[PDB]
């Protein structure tokens, strides 16, 4: 083996990842779209981000 | 190429003549401060009848909104910010009015009553203009849209989110106040950072 490795240490960086939403049009028929991404945790604050998606109109 | 705005005012007959003063204050400050090299500015009168001031082409001539929009006087009539909309879409967005192509297109509206009289519904109307790409923000004055069940037309109006692109006003002098937001909103083109 190698070494028995608990809980040692908890890793830090953001208090989460970024939520990852998908692309949901405002017109079946062709139109614009939008996303929107919240991050929350103990010391991290209330962060939004809302962005706008394309249809292909394939 | 940059962007293409353009203002649709509501010329209603609720609208008294010195607040209607007000509305024209609030579209050429707010124009001036939108001012760009490559912005262009558009604007349509609408109460029963539409009736454009002018066009990209002629702001790209006469680049003062004080000299374009001093000259507008009421029309006088119902609401039909439904049809209207649809003639910003399909001629002060043409190109042959000064529109410019591939250039981001913002369309504004304000109105002080709910959609009357019009025979054209907003789902005839909106579902075009996200096809083109028009995002739209609009500003709600007066009695009319202190009711959650007329804010829905608002959002109905604008783009996703409501909380993004609809603005409430009590007064028609209360909008100098929200011209400050409006200008930085219309400039952010994507969610930036802190």
Same mark, same amino acid.
């Given at each position: 083996?190698? %070494?028995?490795?608990?809980?040692?240490?908890?890793?830090?960086?953001?208090?989460?990842?970024?939520?990852?939403?998908?692309?949901?049009?405002?017109?079946?028929?062709?139109?614009?779209?939008? *996303?929107?991404?919240? *991050?929350?945790?103990?010391?991290?604050?209330?962060?939004? %981000?809302?962005? *706008?998606? %394309?249809?292909?109109?394939? | 190429?940059?962007?293409?705005?353009?203002?649709?005012?509501?010329?209603?007959?609720?609208?008294?003549?010195?607040? !209607? /003063?007000?509305?024209?204050?609030?579209?050429?400050?707010?124009?001036?401060?939108?001012?760009?090299?490559?912005?262009? !500015?558009?604007?349509?009168?609408?109460?029963?009848?539409?009736?454009?001031?002018?066009?990209?082409?002629?702001?790209?001539?006469?680049?003062?909104?004080?000299?374009?929009?001093?000259?507008?006087?009421?029309?006088?009539?119902?609401?039909?910010?439904?049809?209207?909309?649809?003639?910003?879409?399909?001629?002060?967005?043409?190109?042959?009015?000064?529109? /410019?192509?591939?250039?981001?297109?913002?369309?504004?509206?304000?109105?002080?009553?709910?959609?009357?009289?019009?025979?054209?519904?907003?789902?005839?109307?909106?579902?075009?203009?996200?096809?083109?790409?028009?995002? /739209?923000?609009?500003?709600?004055?007066?009695?009319?849209?202190?009711?959650?069940?007329? /804010?829905?037309?608002?959002?109905?109006?604008?783009?996703?989110?409501?909380?993004?692109?609809? !603005?409430?006003?009590?007064?028609?002098?209360?909008?100098?106040?929200?011209?400050?937001?409006?200008?930085?909103?219309?400039?952010?083109?994507?969610?930036?950072?802190?």
């Amino acid at each position: 083996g190698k %070494k028995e490795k608990p809980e040692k240490k908890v890793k830090k960086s953001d208090c989460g990842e970024w939520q990852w939403s998908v692309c949901v049009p405002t017109s079946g028929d062709c139109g614009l779209g939008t *996303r929107e991404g919240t *991050r929350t945790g103990a010391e991290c604050k209330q962060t939004m %981000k809302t962005q *706008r998606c %394309k249809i292909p109109c394939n | 190429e940059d962007s293409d705005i353009a203002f649709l005012i509501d010329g209603s007959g609720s609208i008294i003549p010195h607040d !209607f /003063r007000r509305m024209k204050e609030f579209v050429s400050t707010v124009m001036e401060q939108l001012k760009k090299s490559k912005t262009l !500015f558009s604007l349509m009168q609408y109460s029963e009848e539409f009736r454009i001031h002018f066009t990209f082409k002629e702001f790209q001539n006469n680049p003062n909104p004080r000299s374009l929009v001093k000259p507008i006087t009421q029309l006088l009539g119902r609401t039909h910010t439904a049809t209207g909309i649809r003639k910003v879409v399909r001629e002060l967005f043409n190109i042959t009015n000064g529109a /410019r192509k591939n250039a981001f297109k913002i369309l504004v509206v304000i109105t002080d009553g709910e959609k009357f009289g019009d025979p054209l519904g907003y789902e005839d109307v909106i579902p075009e203009a996200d096809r083109e790409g028009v995002i /739209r923000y609009v500003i709600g004055v007066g009695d009319a849209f202190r009711s959650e069940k007329s /804010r829905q037309e608002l959002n109905t109006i604008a783009s996703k989110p409501p909380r993004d692109h609809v !603005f409430q006003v009590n007064n028609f002098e209360a909008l100098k106040t929200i011209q400050n937001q409006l200008r930085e909103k219309i400039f952010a083109i994507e969610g930036t950072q802190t």
